[PDB]
Design a protein around this ligand. Structure first.
Ligand SMILES: OCCCCCCBr
Ligand SMILES: OCCCCCCBr
Ligand SMILES: OCCCCCCBr
Ligand SMILES: OCCCCCCBr
Ligand SMILES: OCCCCCCBr
Ligand SMILES: OCCCCCCBr
Ligand SMILES: OCCCCCCBr
Ligand SMILES: OCCCCCCBr
Ligand SMILES: [Ca+2]
Ligand SMILES: [Fe+3]
Ligand SMILES: [Fe+3]
Ligand SMILES: [Fe+3]
Ligand SMILES: [Fe+3]
Lengths: 166, 388, 510, 388, 510
């Protein structure tokens, strides 16, 4: 079974998700999943074709478990890991405002998403973060956007140039 | 110019014969129903559904999406164009919602246009019929111009609360409903100003400037908590569903209904004012139209979701508790307005009874749908403390 | 006691005062810019009047469609090729209209001035109208046309092919993902101001030329709404002109937006017009140079110089790569015909003559290719041949730009032949130009779109088509076809028998 | 078949080529304006005039006629199809009249259609909003069901008074105006029943039957003289101009305007009734609409006729007196209705203020036009002599 | 608190009770019948719903007209002959729609049952709608067509010619002058029930065949309202079926009404269709027999048998006189072309072949005459020949029936050739048939209409034309023409120079 919308990998993960009966275990699995399979910094591209869908299924389980485990106040203001959402947001924004260059900034924003994306952090705090973190990231990145030659930009990004044609 | 230089394939003999010669004997498929693959909510698929469902290019990783793969271009940082991360609510399919009124753009602007033209006819008839002669002066210059006028900012704020949803809604059917709920709110704010502008034209000395109503809204006491609630609902909520649900299924259903129906619609007639009720009729019709859509989305689709019913109700109960407090504060501060009325206008018993109607309607139409255990007398007693 | 009333402008006079100050009254979206507090709007409308003006247009439009046009059998008397073109034209435009709803909601949120918010709001409502109008065109041709397939399910069948990926880049994601201002430049300052004429108006011309009076009726109505959106775009620049951030970032975002939009527009629109029609209106080359290069790139953009706006620095490259772009792409579109949701045709004799005449050297390159494919039996199901096979035999790999999603075959193209392959953190990336390359290098996390080869790798062609419902109602005949005739249509079995299996072309690189 | 068997000249290659070949190089006359010979009432000829003026085939012997000769077929006895003999009024041209609203059939039904759809939306919102909860039971079950309902027969009778005018009108512009005046009247009557039917649906034991409201009209005391006046204007007048004039410029301008506005429209709000006023708003809008047309015809055209100004003003002044009396009786009997209102509902000071509003408005819009010197105080006094 | 409302039917349930008994509650018009006060109507409508159902129709109609049809130049791409035909068709129908307003107003006054009054009322409004619709047709062809003259002023230019007189007899005076029931029979039981198909629907067919999509758009909308009027006519018979007067007068008023209507309809409509077009739909003889003789005279009337209704005794007589009626009349209409407000054309070769094929013997009579007139130069102003001169030369007098106003030429006609001439109290009277003769003899004072010869006697032709504005905007070229080409149009002088003077043909018997 190798289909686009239905296949063995997806089926396997659905089973793996059904075995998360506790919030802490499920939340940890979701965060680990994001480090392993999301963003260009993912540990591996093995799940490239199904990670988006699998991640969503895992999010569903964490959300349901969080809602049942948390009182009303904590559901609104605490991350799935028990951290004060506001403190995390402010602390991350503080680090972003102290970022010295666009390289440190991208690491900050991307890492924030992999670790706190809902249902880990409440949506209100998370998107307020997207608002602030995204602003600084772009301000640093779009300054003198074309000055660095592609030859040098390839080196900064750290890609391995495999082939060039022109 | 009689015939023209542009030759059209449908009427030009030479071109038309070429076209016809290339045509097949019959259609290359007998299934002439666009959207045939959409699961109909009613007996047969509707034009509303066909023209709307699946317009949004969601991939399958956003519940109900038919596409596949990541978005082509995301935000700096990685945020998806649309994503599950923009709201706490979960569902088996974001495309299940259906506006019970089946409003796509054409029917929507058609009805609003009819209302605009009839409104113009009404005003010309009202002014020519000199009906303004019987309207109590103090009610007109004090309560309509200042207090009803300040309420436009409440509706304007609720309109603006919809901006983020217009961008983040996870489906076409929800985006269209959401946009129309918002557009009707700005319409009402504009109708309140329209009435003030009309009075300025037929009442010597009547100033249509928004300075007075705006100062009342921004610095008065009657609307202080209402404004604090509106500012929060609009700018402190980053979850498009929390916004739409809290606005329509909590704040506007309690505070909005009380102000529009139990205060102004209820007392205007008593002062010879058939003008304000004309516009409030539109606002209430709009409220009832939106209510159907709001109930379908939050109760029929999400609150009763076959997989996330329990979860979604927990979240909505959370939101109701979160916004019920600020809503009660808004009603409590609004109670101060009754002490401004001429003696004998109304009494504590009428006020209370009217609060219970609003609270009871809310329990029936909203709270009970998610098992929120509202205490009607506790809610009312809390509001009444605001009476002077 | 005379009859009096109040109009829109009389209420609009006080709309700017509707917003008020409070600590958290600020946009919820990330942006490098500051939209001025007192920005105004050009059209003094209110909800009621907006509805009335659109309602009047609808009456006319639907009246024509439901009455006279239906009586004239206008849904049928259209050239087969144009019937197919409209499946793509109308459904692909539909997604642009749709995402523009979200885009203007995001812009409405960005604006702080009540009037600027209101201006964006009118567009939010207009884009919902346009979405439903484009849907109606497909709805009409499916109900009354010569071939409903594709017209009736493009919303799901468009997902099978690679050309759809590129459309989502410029008309979906490009409109809503990024700095709100960048999105505005993609949507309004570039998209709508630059394409309205060469796309919307031009389409009504090509439509009429091919017997289609349905599209002109709807699209001409859509067009009457655009002035407001161009104004929104113009005012966006005005609103941020006085902020120091403007001089630092505006031209960069504008340049990126321009390259993004033209990258897809240039090859795809020219392809739909010249290869999706029988009767030709005008050679795409000149239509492009006049509207994109001269009118927009010169006149329009020039009027914004006062606000610090400059001509896109990539405008030169766009022009250079433009000439053969659409010709190069149709070769690939036809070669991959089984992945579409529409029927394609090889140029006929009159067309080849037209092509060669307007594009010297066309025949020696593309012309001869089509003649060989014809000889190989690409139109006949029993041939067991798909142009795809020709690319394999002649070792001409087809890549997918990681940023724009536009397919390109550098070893065969008469146009751009650049190819850049990079490896990063365990993944390979392929780029067709220097602008998109910088975009990915600078913003890797914004561009992780899986391409058809990556998703379909190891899959047999007919299996993908079946899973994604690329079949007609008989459950066997393909929606897509290599010819537009009424007989000898390919079935799923005709494809399966060819045992074509997808492979990722980038894997060859070590 | 896909193409059909019928070949149409506009799209069929062969047939269209023949048609094109036969066409002239350019239009055979540059005057492309239909009705160009009609004297515009305004700056430029209107669609309304072009499409209406001279549709009636009158010969020159009927003031303004452009045709010649006698009719082709007349009544047994010799009475002409249309003739000067069907009205006392005379003029230089029966086609002078112009509806200030310029209503031809399309605009007329468009407007009424909008009103019908909005009305339905209103009623759905009203019911859904539970606004009936604030309406006074007695007013609802007694004054609205019996007295408002009985008034439907008054509007119905006035509608029927137009039947002969529909047949005898001496011009197209007048015929169209008259028809619309009568059609609006029956609409109002039907809107009276609509409301009663709406009440029957949302009020448990409310009986929608006309049984009660009919006996009140046919046997009641409050509408006894009203009915007597109606029966006369309808079946006793054989002059289509006397009927239209007396009905709209006398009886309905006084009695009708009082019953509708100065009573139900003024008192309904006090009993928490925003429903009835919704329909009165239409009746009043319709009244004002017809008023502009009635004025233009009998005043601007006939009253100010370059050759029959004096003669007509005389005839109209004469009619005003003939019906001003039966109209006074109608109001007097209506006064007896107040004695049934909830003690304290209204005082003689209010009625006098309202009575003068009507009478005064009448003199400012009708009386002073044909110089019918009337005494406001004596009229009000004669009518006021019918109270408790 | 469930959303609730009320519909038309729910109100109409109580409409019948609206009317109340009282002294003079009786019709104001003379009549021999008594309409039962308990009569009901088929459609349960109230004013507001009526307005809505018609507004929707208007939407589609005007939408098609203002938008699509105008964009297709539909007002122009019509055969010259049909452009001319519509000047007559729309304006002549206009007066029937108009007088129908007054007629139903009179019937509304006649009916005593509130429901029957309401049914007639709906028609009152419908006929106003139709009056404006026909007006709009002329208005549209005037504004956008190949020849505005006639379309722009028919309301006054129609008074010049003799054909207009007959039109007023059936569609104006016949609809409103006489017993209300006789008027109902002329208008609804005969006119509407019998002609709706062979006239309105047929017109849309002939129009489409000739390139005219404007008329179908409007006339098909008019047609959707006719069912209500046929129902009104049907209920008129039902409402008086009980009254004893019915058995004594119904079939008589019905026979007179039928003959009256067919007398004009038979020759004139056949003329407009066959001679006012290029492309033919069906031979008029076939259409007439199927609709008038078969469908109406048989099926429709038959169903009214239970109410004492019998097929007109003059039905057989009508079928006999019908065959050559339209052919005989066009000879007269063309011979008198200068008195019209439309341009006429002689049959071309294909047409003559068509006429001969469908009417054996047509060529030997009409065909040869037309060729003779053409060779003599009837189409050329420099010839100095107007066909009326040929009638004088060959002693073929043209009379005007005192009752029907239809022109007839006994000495030349291939059809009826009977002629009865009487003198009474110093006045001569000419009759063309036994039915109309009886009408005059029994009711002399109902028929005193002066004919064109009596009014124009002693007057020179160009003088009548000039006085009644039978000119184009250049103040010299005639509106009417003997050909439909764009060159060599006749002027007032081309006519004046011939010195043709009107004479009362009846005085020849002095
Ligand atoms: O009608 C031809 C279809 C056009 C094909 C290319 C897909 Br963008
Ligand atoms: O207006 C909707 C957004 C896309 C517009 C493209 C200009 Br043709
Ligand atoms: O640049 C816009 C590309 C449009 C592709 C098909 C739409 Br009309
Ligand atoms: O070529 C014919 C001349 C046109 C006649 C002028 C009519 Br206004
Ligand atoms: O309806 C208007 C009166 C004439 C109707 C004749 C049937 Br085509
Ligand atoms: O029978 C009446 C004939 C009238 C036809 C008028 C032109 Br449609
Ligand atoms: O189109 C030719 C006009 C028809 C003329 C005969 C008069 Br009813
Ligand atoms: O029947 C004789 C034809 C009458 C001649 C016309 C004179 Br204007
Ligand atoms: Ca306070
Ligand atoms: Fe758009
Ligand atoms: Fe747009
Ligand atoms: Fe009619
Ligand atoms: Fe009719």
């Amino acid at each position: 079974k190798l289909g686009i919308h239905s296949n063995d990998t997806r089926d396997a993960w659905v089973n793996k998700i059904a075995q998360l009966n506790t919030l802490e275990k499920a939340a940890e699995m979701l965060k680990q999943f994001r480090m392993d399979h999301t963003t260009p910094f993912r540990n591996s591209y093995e799940l490239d074709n199904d990670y988006l869908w699998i991640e969503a299924k895992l999010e569903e389980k964490v959300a349901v478990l969080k809602a049942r485990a948390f009182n009303e106040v904590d559901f609104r203001h605490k991350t799935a890991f028990g951290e004060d959402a506001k403190s995390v947001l402010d602390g991350t924004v503080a680090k972003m405002n102290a970022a010295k260059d666009k390289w440190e900034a991208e690491k900050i924003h991307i890492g924030f998403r992999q670790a706190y994306k809902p249902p880990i952090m409440p949506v209100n705090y998370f998107l307020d973060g997207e608002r602030q973190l995204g602003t600084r990231l772009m301000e640093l990145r779009n300054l003198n956007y074309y000055d660095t030659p592609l030859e040098e930009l390839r080196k900064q990004r750290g890609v391995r140039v495999v082939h060039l044609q022109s | 110019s009689m015939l023209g230089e542009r030759r059209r394939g449908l009427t030009d003999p030479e071109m038309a014969a070429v076209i016809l010669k290339a045509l097949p004997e019959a259609p290359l498929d007998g299934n002439n129903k666009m959207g045939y693959f959409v699961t109909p909510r009613w007996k047969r698929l509707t034009e509303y559904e066909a023209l709307t469902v699946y317009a949004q290019p969601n991939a399958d990783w956003i519940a109900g999406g038919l596409d596949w793969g990541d978005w082509t271009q995301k935000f700096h940082g990685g945020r998806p164009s649309w994503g599950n991360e923009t709201t706490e609510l979960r569902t088996v399919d974001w495309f299940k919602h259906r506006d019970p009124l089946r409003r796509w753009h054409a029917p929507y602007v058609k009805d609003k246009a009819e209302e605009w033209r009839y409104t113009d006819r009404f005003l010309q008839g009202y002014s020519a019929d000199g009906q303004i002669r019987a309207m109590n002066p103090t009610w007109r210059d004090e309560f309509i111009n200042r207090y009803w006028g300040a309420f436009l900012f409440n509706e304007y704020g609720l309109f603006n609360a919809h901006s983020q949803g217009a961008r983040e809604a996870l489906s076409d059917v929800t985006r269209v409903s959401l946009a129309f709920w918002g557009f009707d709110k700005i319409d009402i704010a504009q109708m309140i100003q329209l009435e003030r502008g009309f009075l300025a034209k037929i009442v010597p000395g009547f100033d249509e400037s928004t300075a007075v109503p705006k100062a009342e809204w921004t610095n008065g006491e009657v609307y202080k908590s209402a404004r604090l609630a509106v500012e929060g609902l609009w700018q402190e909520v980053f979850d498009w569903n929390e916004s739409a649900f809290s606005v329509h299924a909590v704040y506007d259903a309690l505070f909005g209904q009380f102000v529009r129906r139990e205060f102004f619609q209820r007392l205007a007639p008593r002062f010879g004012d058939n003008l304000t009720p004309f516009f409030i009729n539109q606002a209430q019709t709009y409220f009832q139209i939106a209510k159907q859509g709001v109930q379908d989305l939050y109760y029929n689709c999400l609150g009763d979701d076959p997989e996330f019913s329990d979860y979604n109700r927990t979240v909505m109960r959370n939101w109701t508790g979160k916004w019920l407090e600020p809503t009660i504060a808004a009603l409590r501060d609004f109670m101060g307005l009754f002490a401004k009325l001429p003696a004998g206008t109304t009494d504590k018993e009428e006020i209370t009874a009217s609060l219970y109607r609003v609270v009871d309607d809310w329990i029936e139409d909203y709270a009970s749908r998610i098992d929120f255990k509202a205490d009607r007398d506790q809610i009312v007693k809390a509001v009444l403390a605001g009476l002077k | 006691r005379a009859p009096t009333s109040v109009n829109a402008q009389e209420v609009h006079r006080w709309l700017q005062s509707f917003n008020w100050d409070f600590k958290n009254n600020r946009t919820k979206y990330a942006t490098k810019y500051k939209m001025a507090n007192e920005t105004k709007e050009q059209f003094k409308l209110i909800a009621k009047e907006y509805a009335r003006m659109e309602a009047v247009k609808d009456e006319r439009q639907f009246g024509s469609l439901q009455d006279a046009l239906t009586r004239l059998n206008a849904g049928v008397r259209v050239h087969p090729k144009w019937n197919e073109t409209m499946k793509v034209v109308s459904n692909f435009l539909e997604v642009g209209e749709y995402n523009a709803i979200a885009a203007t909601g995001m812009l409405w949120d960005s604006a702080q001035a009540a009037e600027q918010k209101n201006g964006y709001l009118a567009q939010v409502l207009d884009e919902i109208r346009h979405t439903h109008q484009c849907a109606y065109v497909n709805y009409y041709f499916a109900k009354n046309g010569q071939d409903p397939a594709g017209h009736n399910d493009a919303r799901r069948t468009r997902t099978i092919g690679p050309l759809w990926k590129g459309m989502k880049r410029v008309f979906s994601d490009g409109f809503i993902s990024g700095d709100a201002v960048e999105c505005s430049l993609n949507l309004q300052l570039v998209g709508e101001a630059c394409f309205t004429n060469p796309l919307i108006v031009a389409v009504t011309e090509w439509a009429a030329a091919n017997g289609d009076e349905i599209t002109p009726t709807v699209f001409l109505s859509i067009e009457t709404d655009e002035l407001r959106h161009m104004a929104n775009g113009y005012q966006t620049v005005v609103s941020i002109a006085n902020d120091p951030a403007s001089a630092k970032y505006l031209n960069t975002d504008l340049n990126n937006a321009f390259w993004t939009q033209q990258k897809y527009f240039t090859p795809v629109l020219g392809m739909l017009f010249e290869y999706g029609s029988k009767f030709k209106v005008e050679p795409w080359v000149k239509t492009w140079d006049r509207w994109v290069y001269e009118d927009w790139g010169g006149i329009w953009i020039g009027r914004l110089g006062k606000y610090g706006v400059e001509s896109p620095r990539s405008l030169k490259d766009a022009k250079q790569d433009a000439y053969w772009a659409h010709h190069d792409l149709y070769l690939l579109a036809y070669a991959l015909w089984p992945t579409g949701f529409f029927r394609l045709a090889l140029p006929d004799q009159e067309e080849m003559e037209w092509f060669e005449a307007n594009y010297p050297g066309w025949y020696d390159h593309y012309g001869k290719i089509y003649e060989e494919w014809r000889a190989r039996g690409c139109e006949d199901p029993s041939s067991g041949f798909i142009p795809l096979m020709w690319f394999i035999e002649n070792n001409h790999p087809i890549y997918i730009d990681r940023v724009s999603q536009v397919p390109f075959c550098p070893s065969l193209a008469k146009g751009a032949s650049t190819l850049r392959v990079h490896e990063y953190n365990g993944e390979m990336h392929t780029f067709s130009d220097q602008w998109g390359e910088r975009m990915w290098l600078a913003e890797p996390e914004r561009y992780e779109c899986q391409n058809i080869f990556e998703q379909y790798e190891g899959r047999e062609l007919s299996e993908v088509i079946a899973e994604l419902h690329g079949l007609r109602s008989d459950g066997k005949t393909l929606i897509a076809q290599p010819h537009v005739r009424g007989d000898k249509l390919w079935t799923l079995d005709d494809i399966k028998r060819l045992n074509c299996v997808f492979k990722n072309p980038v894997k060859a690189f070590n």
